[PDB]
Design a binder for this molecule. Structure first.
Ligand SMILES: Nc1ncnc2c1ncn2[C@@H]1O[C@H](CSCC[C@H](N)C(=O)O)[C@@H](O)[C@H]1O
Ligand code: NA
Ligand code: NA
Length: 216
């Protein structure tokens, strides 16, 4: 068995989590501007939910689900600052949740995928399909196993991601992507044990995959 529950809750309680960049992940924002996000949106493993909030400002009704109660507090607090009525959040387990049958037209996984055990993937994919309206779109941003080793994080190879997701969705594209964060100084050692790319605006990125799919 393996579990990151205590770590995520401690990170959100707080120094802020490196992945809480205060904006949607750039790779996913690019899909939004292309018009790929439609209708009611589910932000699964939402964390502080920057992408939910950006979508709710654009007129979408959004729901964010996270196993961490501290994440859900932060998401609600930023929704209050922005005066949003159309963004809601709930504490739930993405691998086994109900109550939203056929509700969502777009489901977005912004780095949740690698944050659960490999054995939970089936239940997660079944749960989001159950919550999906006909023809829904699904987008995943996930670490690449070439960048993040076997350990607490269950990063994926392209073939592994395709095999897991294609059992439940029609895959349109899988391509290399960057996952952005603001890591502390000396993150992962000196020398560093991971390949961390330095980006503009003091951000960093790690290699990943961006998958686009739709319910068949
Ligand atoms: N089984 C599960 N169900 C729901 N959320 C989960 C989960 N396992 C992990 N999480 C959540 O997955 C998130 C991964 S970090 C990414 C958070 C956010 N989507 C962002 O892009 O900033 C964390 O908020 C963590 O608490
Ligand atoms: Na988890
Ligand atoms: Na690219």
């Amino acid at each position: 068995t393996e579990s990151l529950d205590l770590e995520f809750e401690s990170a959100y309680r707080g120094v802020r989590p490196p992945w809480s960049i205060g904006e949607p992940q750039p790779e996913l924002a690019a899909l939004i501007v292309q018009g790929k996000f439609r209708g009611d949106v589910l932000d699964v493993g939402c964390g502080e939910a920057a992408i939910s909030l950006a979508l709710a400002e654009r007129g979408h009704t959004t729901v964010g689900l996270d196993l961490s109660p501290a994440a859900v507090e932060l998401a609600r607090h930023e929704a209050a600052k922005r005066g949003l009525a159309n963004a809601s959040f709930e504490v739930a387990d993405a691998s086994s949740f109900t109550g939203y049958d056929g509700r969502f037209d777009t489901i977005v996984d912004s780095t949740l995928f690698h944050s659960m055990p490999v054995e939970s993937r089936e239940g997660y994919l079944q749960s989001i399909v159950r919550a999906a309206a006909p023809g829904a779109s699904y987008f995943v941003l996930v670490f690449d196993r070439a960048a993040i080793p076997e350990g607490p994080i269950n990063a994926v190879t392209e073939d592994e991601l395709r095999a897991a997701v294609s059992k439940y969705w029609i895959i349109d594209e899988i391509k290399p992507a960057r996952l952005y964060a603001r890591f502390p100084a000396g993150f992962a050692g000196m020398p560093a044990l991971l390949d961390i790319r330095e980006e503009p605006n003091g951000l960093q990125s790690i290699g990943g995959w961006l998958l686009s799919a739709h319910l068949g």
